[PDB]
Design an enzyme around this catalytic site. Structure first.
Site, PDB file in Angstrom:
ATOM      1  N   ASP A 309     -21.329   2.193   4.865  1.00 19.16           N
ATOM      2  CA  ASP A 309     -21.979   3.066   5.806  1.00 19.16           C
ATOM      3  C   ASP A 309     -21.770   4.557   5.471  1.00 19.16           C
ATOM      4  O   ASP A 309     -20.817   4.908   4.808  1.00 19.16           O
ATOM      5  CB  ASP A 309     -21.406   2.743   7.179  1.00 19.16           C
ATOM      6  CG  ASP A 309     -22.063   3.506   8.253  1.00 19.16           C
ATOM      7  OD1 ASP A 309     -23.189   3.135   8.590  1.00 19.16           O
ATOM      8  OD2 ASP A 309     -21.547   4.507   8.793  1.00 19.16           O
ATOM      9  N   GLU A 338     -25.135   3.432   1.977  1.00 27.68           N
ATOM     10  CA  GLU A 338     -26.138   4.006   2.854  1.00 27.68           C
ATOM     11  C   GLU A 338     -26.110   5.525   2.721  1.00 27.68           C
ATOM     12  O   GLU A 338     -25.286   6.212   3.329  1.00 27.68           O
ATOM     13  CB  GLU A 338     -25.879   3.625   4.302  1.00 27.68           C
ATOM     14  CG  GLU A 338     -26.966   4.109   5.254  1.00 27.68           C
ATOM     15  CD  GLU A 338     -26.456   4.431   6.644  1.00 27.68           C
ATOM     16  OE1 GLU A 338     -25.339   4.981   6.781  1.00 27.68           O
ATOM     17  OE2 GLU A 338     -27.190   4.137   7.612  1.00 27.68           O
TER      18      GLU A 338
END
Ligand SMILES: [Ca+2]
Ligand SMILES: [Ca+2]
Length: 597
Positions: A309, A338
């Site tokens: 993330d 990400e």
């Protein structure tokens, strides 16, 4: 806290690639202790203490001769002695060379809290702060691992081969604990989802059904209720503990020739919200802690990969070392970062093998293809545009900027953006275009749970909750049950069937997995591309117009090579390719042909 309240990682393995192990021991005055141990193949290298006497870092070197077994670590000093049993496990056969998810895989993403509540008794757990509330869009709904395991057949049956749940690690926040992105204990699955052991079971049960398990990890920050916050290991364990310093999200500042140090630092040290302290990853103790923890999870739970993330919000040097460490343990692992940018150069920077202007290097094998998804959503939604597909075409043309563009993850949607169906304007035909695109591109496709039954959401403003509604059939007493099909609308059933048909079909198309791609510049929002190799050609043709279109096939002869016709896998109809291709309004065709000469 007891004399030894936390021992992290809680156990390790014999035969890891990196020999060093740095134990973080937390306990009342453990920092005043000296450590020792006696076990063949394991050496106590050193111990580090910090001003906070409740912590002790113990550095071990585990040699190749080290065998699976256990040994006491004994602590002496401060007028006492403590013993702590530490275990070295044998690694499962083929662990190091585990095959990470790849192009032949299709990823099904769920949010554990919102998928299936297989055990209502864990919806609330004594000692967890937040009480479940299924009526609150940002509350805990009760989804859990038992629910997920119970529906793996459904997932496998749809044709997916990798399961990606948002983080399941303890999030003991007062509010919004459901999302999982604010860890309060990196070594513990949130009790509301299940136990550490249930997670391993999820993995093993997935594996039986031919599915890998991808863990969503957060490296940059933690939850303000993390146990560290009540007793910070060091004054520089987190960035900006005092005054709240929010990040301003200037992501390019870390990869920009005209950058101000202030912006770059703000990007990697700034907090998202006052509820998520930012970890100081330039502190070596923090870096090691994170690297070890993620390895621990992979090895412990038999993961096939990681999704990292808010990738770039971590310190750059740390990311270099982290990806290096992980990939050294698992050279065939896949990990997807990400990096939230719709700019190709900005995302490409992070991929392993990328020659960067500033010399930045990385071992991150994959990133989320936001640019491509953004281009396609734009092309589907911008009806006022005559050739919006051009954006997809041009973005795809920039694949050369990535060292391994075909290892990128292409998603139909995810829990942070509008539902695919809604992004498509709730038009089945456009949704189907997106779907085929997803299933035929030279990417690793990722699909967001719920999109197979056309779940809707808002498309403007902030409304994350609308993207994360409970999967129908996940809770006892649901009117609509997507698992069984009961209460599903005919359109939703057609959508579910299409995903099943396509995903299952894709698993048997090595040409999609590994083949080449040749695309043609879209004209008047019609677009043609081919996937091919010597065994097969797959032609995708879409007409993103509410009117029929005819495309002379002379244009595509370098791919068609005189093929008279081919069968459209979607409709089963035979489509003629001799002179022209007649596309119905808002249609997409997937034509299969024999290989080239
Ligand atoms: Ca539950
Ligand atoms: Ca950060």
């Amino acid at each position: 806290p007891t004399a030894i309240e936390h021992m992290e990682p809680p156990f390790w393995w014999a035969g890891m690639q990196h020999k060093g192990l740095q134990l973080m021991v937390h306990g009342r005055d453990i920092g005043r202790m000296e450590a020792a141990l006696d076990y063949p193949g394991v050496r106590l290298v050193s111990t580090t203490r910090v001003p906070n006497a409740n912590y002790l870092f113990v550095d071990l070197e585990i040699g190749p001769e080290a065998q699976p077994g256990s040994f006491d670590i004994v602590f002496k000093g401060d007028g006492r002695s403590e013993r702590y049993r530490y275990r070295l496990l044998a690694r499962e056969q083929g662990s190091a060379q585990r095959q990470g998810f790849g192009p032949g895989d299709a990823i099904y993403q769920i949010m554990p809290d919102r998928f299936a509540n297989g055990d209502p008794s864990n919806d609330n757990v004594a000692g967890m702060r937040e009480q479940a509330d299924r009526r609150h869009g940002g509350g805990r709904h009760g989804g859990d691992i038992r629910g997920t395991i119970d529906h793996l057949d459904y997932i496998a049956g749809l044709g997916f081969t990798q399961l990606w749940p948002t983080p399941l690690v303890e999030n003991d926040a007062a509010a919004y604990s459901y999302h999982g992105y604010a860890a309060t204990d990196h070594y513990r699955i949130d009790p509301r989802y299940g136990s550490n052991e249930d997670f391993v079971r999820l993995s093993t049960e997935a594996r039986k059904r031919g599915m890998g398990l991808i863990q969503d990890v957060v490296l940059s920050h933690i939850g303000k209720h993390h146990w560290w916050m009540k007793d910070l290991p060091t004054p520089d364990w987190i960035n900006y503990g005092g005054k709240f310093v929010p990040t301003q999200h200037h992501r390019v500042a870390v990869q920009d020739p005209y950058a101000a140090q202030a912006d770059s630092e703000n990007f990697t040290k700034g907090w998202f919200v006052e509820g998520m302290p930012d970890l100081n990853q330039t502190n070596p103790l923090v870096a090691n802690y994170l690297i070890q923890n993620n390895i621990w999870w992979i090895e412990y739970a038999g993961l096939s990969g990681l999704r990292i993330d808010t990738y770039g919000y971590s310190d750059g040097a740390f990311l270099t070392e982290y990806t290096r460490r992980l990939m050294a343990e698992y050279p065939r692992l896949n990990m997807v970062g990400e990096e939230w940018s719709t700019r190709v150069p900005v995302v490409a920077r992070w991929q392993r093998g990328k020659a960067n202007f500033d010399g930045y290097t990385s071992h991150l094998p994959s990133l989320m293809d936001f640019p491509l998804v953004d281009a396609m959503r734009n092309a589907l939604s911008k009806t006022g545009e005559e050739n919006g597909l051009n954006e997809v075409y041009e973005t795809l043309s920039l694949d050369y900027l990535y060292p391994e563009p075909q290892n990128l993850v292409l998603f139909g949607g995810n829990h942070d953006m509008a539902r695919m169906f809604s992004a498509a304007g709730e038009d089945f035909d456009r949704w189907r275009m997106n779907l085929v695109f997803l299933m035929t591109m030279p990417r690793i496709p990722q699909f967001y749970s719920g999109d197979e039954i056309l779940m809707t959401s808002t498309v403007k403003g902030r409304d994350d909750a609308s993207y994360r509604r409970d999967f129908p059939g996940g809770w006892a007493g649901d009117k609509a049950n997507a698992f069984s099909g009961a209460g599903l609308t005919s359109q939703q059933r057609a959508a579910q069937d299409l995903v099943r048909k396509l995903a299952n079909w894709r698993k048997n198309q090595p040409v999609i997995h590994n083949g080449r791609l040749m695309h043609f510049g879209p004209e008047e929002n019609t677009w043609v591309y081919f996937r091919y190799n010597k065994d097969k050609r797959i032609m995708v043709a879409m007409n993103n117009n509410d009117k029929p279109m005819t495309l002379p096939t002379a244009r595509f002869q370098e791919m068609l090579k005189g093929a008279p016709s081919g069968v459209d896998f979607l409709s089963g109809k035979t489509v003629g390719l001799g002179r022209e291709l007649r596309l119905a309004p808002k249609s997409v065709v997937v034509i299969e042909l024999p290989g080239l000469p």
